[PDB]
Ligand binder design. Structure first.
Ligand SMILES: COC1=C2C[C@@H](C)C[C@H](OC)[C@H](O)[C@@H](C)/C=C(\C)[C@H](OC(N)=O)[C@@H](OC)/C=C\C=C(/C)C(=O)NC(=CC1=O)C2=O
Length: 220
């Protein structure tokens, strides 16, 4: 059922990702960029095929800090991924050479994005990463990994996303700060530069008369 990452690829990625230890907050920049790409794709598709947005009529990025469960969620209503794409694109050449040539013969913070491995920076702050996704052409599925092995299963909750993807991070004890609204809001704003889609953070808001209310708060 489960899978294991390629021995050499894993080892090399461990070193690549670890080199970003002085600026771990970049994982959020990468997840936001990924969401932006998924949203650009569904937006382009919707220009000629309006029914493409039927499963969820909105184009947004919504972030939720679940202090109660020690989880950080980054959800987009982009194009989503099929079960095969989760297994194939989050599980697997001599292209590694091209990556270390860029490493040694040449910055890591700007190379991961270009090499298409920025997603893995999530492991800088998380012991486990879960990817829940729903694409128009398939049912909702869940990918899970501890950075060494991974598995994919049909989501028993059914199609709850409508369309899109949720990146769920099980935060390391030393990354509890990322559950704080102020910290998350600050980072989102710092990394919501060229994203042409609204990004929200589920937050507490002043409700008046001493009342506290919760709602999505626009960051860009
Ligand atoms: C150019 O596309 C990108 C690729 C190539 C490829 C895998 C694209 C993918 O093909 C199935 C879909 O077309 C695309 C819409 C899905 C996302 C961007 C997902 O994010 C969300 N929010 O859906 C992301 O989930 C973690 C997919 C894995 C990301 C990896 C391994 C990475 O590190 N960098 C990548 C960032 C990218 O932008 C990357 O490799």
């Amino acid at each position: 059922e489960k899978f294991a990452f390629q021995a050499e690829v894993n080892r090399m990625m461990k070193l690549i990702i670890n080199s970003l230890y002085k600026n771990k907050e970049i994982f959020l920049r990468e997840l936001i960029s990924n969401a932006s790409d998924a949203l650009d794709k569904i937006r382009l598709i919707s220009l000629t095929d309006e029914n493409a947005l039927a499963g969820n009529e909105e184009l947004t990025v919504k972030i939720k800090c679940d202090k109660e469960k020690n989880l950080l969620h980054v959800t987009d209503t982009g194009v989503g991924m099929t079960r095969e794409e989760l297994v194939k694109n989050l599980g697997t050449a001599a292209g590694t050479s091209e990556f270390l040539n860029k490493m040694t013969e040449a910055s890591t913070s700007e190379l991961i994005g270009q090499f298409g491995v920025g997603f893995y920076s999530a492991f800088l702050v998380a012991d486990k990463v879960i990817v829940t996704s729903k694409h128009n052409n398939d049912t909702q599925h869940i990918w899970e990994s501890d950075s060494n092995e991974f598995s994919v299963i049909a989501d028993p909750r059914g199609n709850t996303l409508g369309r899109g993807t949720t990146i769920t991070l099980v935060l390391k004890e030393e990354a509890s700060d990322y559950l704080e609204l102020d910290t998350i809001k600050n980072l989102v704003k710092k990394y919501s530069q060229f994203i042409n889609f609204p990004i929200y953070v589920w937050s507490s808001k002043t409700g008046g008369g001493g009342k506290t209310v919760w709602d999505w708060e626009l960051m860009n």
